[PDB]
Design a binder for this molecule. Structure first.
Ligand code: A1IF6
Ligand code: A1IF6
Lengths: 229, 228
C-alpha cells in the first residue's frame, strides 16, 4: 500500500507463578513490560503499539508508557493453553471489526525483552517486505551445544542419549540447530489470520547473538548485564 | 586411592585457533582449569596432555605437570577425548608404574568451573560401584524438540514439525554436557566405556555458569566472569 500500517502487539497475561507479577516487576528502573513498549516506540517503524492483557495492573502500566490498551483480552485466551497466534489473531480481528483498521504487517513483541534492539525490529520488517514469498520473520538464536548429542536423566539421575548413534560424533559434523529467541515475530496480517505455521519454509529469521529470564535468580543476573557497556 | 586430573589440551581446534590458551580475563584459558584443580585439593596430580609446546609452557607456568608429549595421532581433528585419557593412564602405568583409581578429565576451556563441583563429582562417583562416570551437565533452556534448521537461502524448517504448537511444559526435559569435567573410574576410561550412558551420573550446573561462539561472546563472558 501507499500508506503503511505496521502494528506491534505485546501479549501480557497476569498470573505468573515462578516470578509473581512478572510483567510489572521492576527491571532496572522500569516495570519489565515497559522495556518492550519503549523498544517498539524507539524503533520508529510502528503506526500503533498495543498491549493485549486481561490484567488491570498490566493495562495501567501499559498506558503509563504510551501503549494502547483498546480492549480487555478475552478470558478464554488468557489461559495456560492459548497460543501466541491465537492472541495476535484476536487483536487483528478486533482492529478490523471494532475500528475498521486492516493492518498490513503485524509484529508480536514479547513482554519480557529488555535486551531487544529496536533496530532489529525494523530489520525484521525490512526482511519481511524484501522477499514477497515470506510470511513471517522471527528472532532466532543458535543452540550452543549440538541438540543431536542431548541427554535425558531418569528419576535416579542416570544418563541416556536422545540419539545414542551420535555418542562419538563431532559437533562440526552435525546439522546446525537454532531456536526461537522468544523476542519478536513479524507476520503478514493474513498469515496470522489464516493460522499459517510460523516455523515453516515461508519464514526467515533474524539471528541474535548469545537471556533466560525465567527465575528470580535469572532476573538478578540480567540486571547486571543490562548496565554493562 | 590415587585420584588425578588429566587436562587434554591439543594445539589444533575445530574452530577457534589456540582456544585452549587464548586469553580469557587476562590469563590463558587453561590457567583457570589448573588453578581450580589446585584449589579443589582432591587431586594427587594435575597433568596436561598436549602435543603443543606453547601449551606445555603455559601448563608448566601455572604449576601443572607435563610428563610426556602427547602423540600427534591423538591430537588431530578426529581423535576423541576418551582416547586421550586412555593414553595418559596407560602412560602412567607403563612409564611410571602409577595405577590411578579415579581419573578426572578436566577441559581447558571451562573458566567458570568450580572447585567444589570437582570434589563433589568424585564423591558421587565413588558412592556407587555401578557408576562409571560423573560429568558436569546443564539443562537446555529451550525445548530441543521445537528446534529449527535453516536452508542455504535462510528458510526455516523444524527438526520435528509435529511439535509446532506444543507447549514447552508438555515435552520431556533435555540436558547437555557442560564441557567442564568428567570423572571416570580408570578402568572405564581404559575399556573405552561410553560416557553418555546409564552407568553415568551428572552434576547439574545452573546454565548461567556454563559459557563461546563469537569474539563478542568472548568479550561478554570475560566481563560476566568478573561480575560472577
Ligand atoms: C566427552 C565428550 O563427549 N565431549 C564432547 C567433545 O566434543 C568435541 O569437543 P572439542 O571442543 O573439539 O574438544 C573439547 C576439548 O578437548 C580437547 N581435545 C579434544 C580431543 C582431543 N583429541 N584432544 C583434545 O585435547 C580440545 O582441545 C578441547 O579443549 C566436539 O565434538 O566438538 C570433541 C571432543 O573430543 C569431545 N568428543 C568426544 C566424543 O570425546 C562434547 C563436549 O560433549
Ligand atoms: C510463536 C511460538 O511458538 N512461541 C513459543 C511460545 O512458547 C510458550 O511460551 P511462554 O513463555 O509460555 O509464553 C510466551 C509469552 O507469551 C505470553 N502469553 C502466552 C500465551 C498466552 N495465551 N498469552 C500470553 O500473554 C507469556 O506470558 C509470555 O510472555 C511455551 O510453550 O513455553 C507458549 C507460547 O504460547 C508460545 N507457543 C506457541 C505455540 O505459540 C516459543 C517461545 O517458541
Amino acid at each position: 500500500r501507499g500508506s503503511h500500517m505496521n502494528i506491534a502487539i505485546i501479549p501480557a497475561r497476569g498470573g505468573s507463578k515462578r516470578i509473581p507479577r512478572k510483567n510489572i516487576k521492576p527491571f532496572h528502573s522500569k516495570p519489565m513490560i515497559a522495556w518492550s513498549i519503549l523498544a517498539a516506540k524507539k524503533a520508529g517503524c510502528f503506526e500503533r503499539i498495543i498491549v493485549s492483557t486481561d490484567d488491570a495492573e498490566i493495562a495501567a502500566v501499559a498506558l503509563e508508557y504510551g501503549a494502547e490498551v483498546p480492549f480487555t483480552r478475552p478470558a478464554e485466551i488468557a489461559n495456560d493453553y492459548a497460543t501466541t497466534g491465537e492472541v495476535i489473531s484476536h487483536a487483528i480481528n478486533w482492529l478490523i471489526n471494532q475500528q475498521g483498521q486492516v493492518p498490513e504487517n503485524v509484529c508480536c513483541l514479547y513482554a519480557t525483552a529488555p535486551f531487544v534492539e529496536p533496530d532489529d525490529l525494523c530489520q525484521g520488517l525490512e526482511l519481511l517486505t524484501f522477499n514477497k514469498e515470506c510470511q513471517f520473520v522471527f528472532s532466532a538464536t543458535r543452540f550452543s551445544f549440538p541438540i543431536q548429542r542431548a541427554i535425558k536423566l531418569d528419576e535416579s539421575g542416570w544418563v541416556s542419549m536422545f540419539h545414542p548413534e551420535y555418542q562419538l560424533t563431532r559437533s562440526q559434523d552435525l546439522e546446525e540447530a537454532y531456536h526461537d529467541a522468544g523476542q519478536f515475530y513479524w507476520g503478514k496480517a493474513n498469515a496470522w489470520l489464516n493460522k499459517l505455521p510460523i516455523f515453516a519454509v515461508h519464514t526467515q529469521v533474524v539471528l541474535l547473538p548469545s537471556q533466560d529470564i525465567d527465575t528470580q535468580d535469572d532476573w538478578l543476573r540480567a540486571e547486571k548485564l543490562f548496565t554493562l557497556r
